[PDB]
Amino acid sequence: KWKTVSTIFLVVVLYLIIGATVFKALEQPQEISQRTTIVIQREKFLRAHPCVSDQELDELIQQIVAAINAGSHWDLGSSFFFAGTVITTIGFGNISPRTEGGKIFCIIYALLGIPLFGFLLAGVGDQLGTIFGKGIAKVEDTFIKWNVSQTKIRIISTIIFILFGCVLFVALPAVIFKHIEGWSALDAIYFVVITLTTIGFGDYVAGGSDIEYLDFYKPVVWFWILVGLAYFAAVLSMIGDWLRVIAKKTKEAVGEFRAHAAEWTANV
Amino acid sequence: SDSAINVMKWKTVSTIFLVVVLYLIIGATVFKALEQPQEISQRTTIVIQREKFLRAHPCVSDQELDELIQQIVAAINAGIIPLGASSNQVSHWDLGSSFFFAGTVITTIGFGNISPRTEGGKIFCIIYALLGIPLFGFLLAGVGDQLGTIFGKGIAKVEDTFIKWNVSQTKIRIISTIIFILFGCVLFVALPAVIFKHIEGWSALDAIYFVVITLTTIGFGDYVAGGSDIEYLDFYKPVVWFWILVGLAYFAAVLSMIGDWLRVIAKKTKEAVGEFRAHAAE
Numbered sequence A: 001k002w003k004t005v006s007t008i009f010l011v012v013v014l015y016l017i018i019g020a021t022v023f024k025a026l027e028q029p030q031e032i033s034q035r036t037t038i039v040i041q042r043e044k045f046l047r048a049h050p051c052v053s054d055q056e057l058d059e060l061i062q063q064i065v066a067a068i069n070a071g072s073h074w075d076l077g078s079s080f081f082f083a084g085t086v087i088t089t090i091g092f093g094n095i096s097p098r099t100e101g102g103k104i105f106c107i108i109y110a111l112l113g114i115p116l117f118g119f120l121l122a123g124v125g126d127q128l129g130t131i132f133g134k135g136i137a138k139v140e141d142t143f144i145k146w147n148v149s150q151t152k153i154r155i156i157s158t159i160i161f162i163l164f165g166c167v168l169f170v171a172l173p174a175v176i177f178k179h180i181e182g183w184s185a186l187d188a189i190y191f192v193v194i195t196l197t198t199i200g201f202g203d204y205v206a207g208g209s210d211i212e213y214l215d216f217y218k219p220v221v222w223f224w225i226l227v228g229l230a231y232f233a234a235v236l237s238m239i240g241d242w243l244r245v246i247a248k249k250t251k252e253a254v255g256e257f258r259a260h261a262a263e264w265t266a267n268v
Numbered sequence B: 001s002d003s004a005i006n007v008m009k010w011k012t013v014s015t016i017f018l019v020v021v022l023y024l025i026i027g028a029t030v031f032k033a034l035e036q037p038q039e040i041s042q043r044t045t046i047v048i049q050r051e052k053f054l055r056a057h058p059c060v061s062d063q064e065l066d067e068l069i070q071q072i073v074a075a076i077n078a079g080i081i082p083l084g085a086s087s088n089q090v091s092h093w094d095l096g097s098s099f100f101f102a103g104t105v106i107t108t109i110g111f112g113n114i115s116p117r118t119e120g121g122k123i124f125c126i127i128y129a130l131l132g133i134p135l136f137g138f139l140l141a142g143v144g145d146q147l148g149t150i151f152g153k154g155i156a157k158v159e160d161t162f163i164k165w166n167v168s169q170t171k172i173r174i175i176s177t178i179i180f181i182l183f184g185c186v187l188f189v190a191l192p193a194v195i196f197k198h199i200e201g202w203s204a205l206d207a208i209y210f211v212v213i214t215l216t217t218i219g220f221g222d223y224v225a226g227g228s229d230i231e232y233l234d235f236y237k238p239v240v241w242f243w244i245l246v247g248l249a250y251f252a253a254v255l256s257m258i259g260d261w262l263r264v265i266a267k268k269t270k271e272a273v274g275e276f277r278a279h280a281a282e
């Protein structure tokens, strides 16, 4: 009958405000640092090359920033990657359609492929879940006849799910990404989380740089994208369940606190 | 029982996998066909300009022009207006733009025009995503449920206005799906698209493109509703916030309905091919 939606809306607004403050705190300093150390560069390149005017260099900069949309972008490999970024809704954006017909086809392609890929991803997740059900069935039998509790064997099994999944789907792909892309470890894990959450900023792409790949590589990361999107769907849903549980525990904690203030003053 | 169903399940998922591969191949072919020509045109017409700059400044070290463009492309990923005429700008990380960024994280739209460069920014972004995505999921579920109850009451009366001669119970459902589609596409894509065109200066197709790319959470970032430096009446960005919330709910509904359409067409086509081979010329 009632909402409950208003309080979670307010919680989301609060979460966004806290996040915005923290992000500003962590990111504005390096931004102003790079801004002043590039206004150093604009006039240290110009005085080191007197033949460039102060206004012809700006013609150069204007056309280079005009080249923001191009720099092939559209070999069958890169367009296959793009189609993947569309139907997965990752949408890195490093590749994007510029002609109107490309955008119209992109609209149709998204509206049809997102549900179809949803079916594929659901099936992949179900098959992984049954494989993992048998896998937990055996270690839930070795460790099961010792008196250990039953409603905590499930939390030990979630511990094992999280750990094994994050080593197979986050850890070793991250180390491979660092050894192949040249990314840092933190940058690799960042890429993993941002792509498998379907956020997909595009500041890092697993086949973007020119660095020449082993050709065994893009298909394997395709497979990793498929299986990791499923794993991360599971992880995000279980975090949601964590949230609803802690939500009711906090609801009862506020109930208890106000109930201990209630008749604590009836103590007259 | 426990296993005899799983063979069937792995069969259907394998054929869905092959269908997805085929869809990706077709899409890639069409996209290459539609986008590579203008790309090579612009590339040769940018090297025309590159050596028009080169056939005008030999005193320039002439190979450092490309390291200069390297540093310019490195500087633009952390947005900049790098010209002497105007050394004054507005920052990527005011609380407004950082609020927008946090939204792009928890919605998983991820436009990317703004993204964390600091190590701590990336670690906090990881934590922020892993916690906010489910939370925003709950919010969006509530928004969708309330929208659905408003629309249920709205259709309840038009489910009687139409009770003339010859009327159905389970086939009036198609007029209700038609009304959902049309009214939703008027409120959540159409008029927001025209607003986006008149305020952002985007084309009509660019506005609708932005709408579709944003509410599906693809979020390329090639168009952003608050990106350009312009005025923005502030009566604008909060209403676009609200539009994002309710339109994400609406588009989740639309995508689920398209999925149902696909499931129906899939089973009708398999039974149709069964029927075909069962005939197979007399």
Ligand SMILES: CCCCCCCCCCCCC/C=C/[C@@H](O)[C@H](CO)NC(=O)CCCCCCCCCCCCCCC
Pocket (backbone or CB within 6 Å): A007, A011, A014, A015, A018, A019, A246, A247, A248, A250, A251, A254, B128, B131
């Ligand atoms: C990382 C960014 C910072 C996160 C900011 C979260 C601050 C919010 C802390 C709880 C206070 C919410 C206000 C209302 C609380 C209750 O009246 C209400 C039900 O009565 N709770 C909920 O609805 C259920 C809402 C429960 C949502 C809790 C979100 C989980 C945060 C995880 C971070 C914990 C770090 C612990 C060390 C600080």
Ligand SMILES: CCCCCCCCCCCCC/C=C/[C@@H](O)[C@H](CO)NC(=O)CCCCCCCCCCCCCCC
Pocket (backbone or CB within 6 Å): A104, A107, A108, A111, A112, B181, B185, B189, B204, B205, B208, B254, B258, B261
């Ligand atoms: C299912 C409902 C989703 C519909 C969401 C999009 C609704 C489109 C309504 C916008 C109409 C605006 C009127 C003016 C349009 C022109 O100024 C504009 C050129 O400037 N044309 C287009 O944008 C051309 C736009 C072309 C629209 C693409 C239509 C593709 C529908 C495919 C649906 C999947 C059906 C699958 C059945 C097997």
Ligand SMILES: *CCC(=O)Nc1ccc(C(=O)NCc2ccc(Cl)cc2Cl)cc1
Pocket (backbone or CB within 6 Å): A072, A073, A074, A075, A077, A078, A079, A081, A084, A085, A088, A090, A094, A095, A205, A206, A207, A208, A209, A218, A219, A221, A222, A225
């Ligand atoms: C064409 C220029 C470019 O960026 N090409 C490019 C980038 C990435 C790939 C690729 O296959 N990456 C692995 C992958 C596969 C699917 C998805 Cl949705 C995402 C990724 Cl990162 C290929 C070509």
Ligand SMILES: *CCC(=O)Nc1ccc(C(=O)NCc2ccc(Cl)cc2Cl)cc1
Pocket (backbone or CB within 6 Å): B091, B092, B093, B094, B096, B097, B098, B100, B102, B103, B104, B105, B107, B109, B113, B114, B224, B225, B226, B227, B237, B240, B241, B244
């Ligand atoms: C600071 C530079 C910049 O890009 N600023 C910017 C862009 C967009 C907004 C904004 O509020 N857009 C509406 C909106 C709200 C939430 C989301 Cl998740 C996405 C959008 Cl487009 C504000 C500031």
Ligand SMILES: CCCCCCCCCCCCCCCC
Pocket (backbone or CB within 6 Å): B022, B023, B026, B269, B270, B273
């Ligand atoms: C624009 C997207 C084109 C992709 C659509 C391909 C059509 C495929 C028709 C069915 C192919 C598999 C049928 C097998 C049924 C037993």
Ligand SMILES: CCCCCCCCCCCC
Pocket (backbone or CB within 6 Å): A112, B015, B016, B019, B265, B266, B269
């Ligand atoms: C499980 C088999 C499904 C095959 C049917 C898919 C049909 C897609 C139609 C796309 C029309 C543009």
Ligand SMILES: CCCCCCCCCC
Pocket (backbone or CB within 6 Å): A100, A101, A102, A104, A105, B030
């Ligand atoms: C300018 C309009 C281009 C539209 C291209 C649509 C391609 C349809 C392929 C099925």
Ligand SMILES: CCCCCCCCCC
Pocket (backbone or CB within 6 Å): A168, A172, A173, A176, A220, A221, A224, A227
């Ligand atoms: C079922 C075993 C899945 C193994 C996944 C390997 C991922 C490759 C890392 C790039």
Ligand SMILES: CCCCCCCC
Pocket (backbone or CB within 6 Å): A185, A186, A189, B123, B126, B127
């Ligand atoms: C909770 C995520 C922390 C990631 C730390 C990575 C350090 C290389």
Ligand SMILES: CCCCCCCC
Pocket (backbone or CB within 6 Å): B187, B191, B192, B193, B195, B196, B239, B240, B243
């Ligand atoms: C319910 C009306 C939403 C209007 C959103 C328009 C903002 C661009």
Ligand SMILES: [K+]
Pocket (backbone or CB within 6 Å): A089, A090, A091, A092, A093, A198, A199, A200, A201, B108, B109, B110, B111, B112, B217, B218, B219, B220, B221
């Ligand atoms: K994105």
Ligand SMILES: [K+]
Pocket (backbone or CB within 6 Å): A088, A089, A090, A197, A198, A199, B107, B108, B109, B216, B217, B218
């Ligand atoms: K997404």
Ligand SMILES: [K+]
Pocket (backbone or CB within 6 Å): A198, B108, B217
């Ligand atoms: K999603």
Ligand SMILES: [K+]
Pocket (backbone or CB within 6 Å): A093, A202, B111, B112, B113, B220, B221, B222
């Ligand atoms: K971008």
Ligand SMILES: [K+]
Pocket (backbone or CB within 6 Å): A089, A090, A091, A198, A199, A200, B108, B109, B110, B217, B218, B219
């Ligand atoms: K995205």
Ligand SMILES: [K+]
Pocket (backbone or CB within 6 Å): A091, A092, A093, A094, A200, A201, A202, B110, B111, B112, B113, B219, B220, B221
């Ligand atoms: K992006």
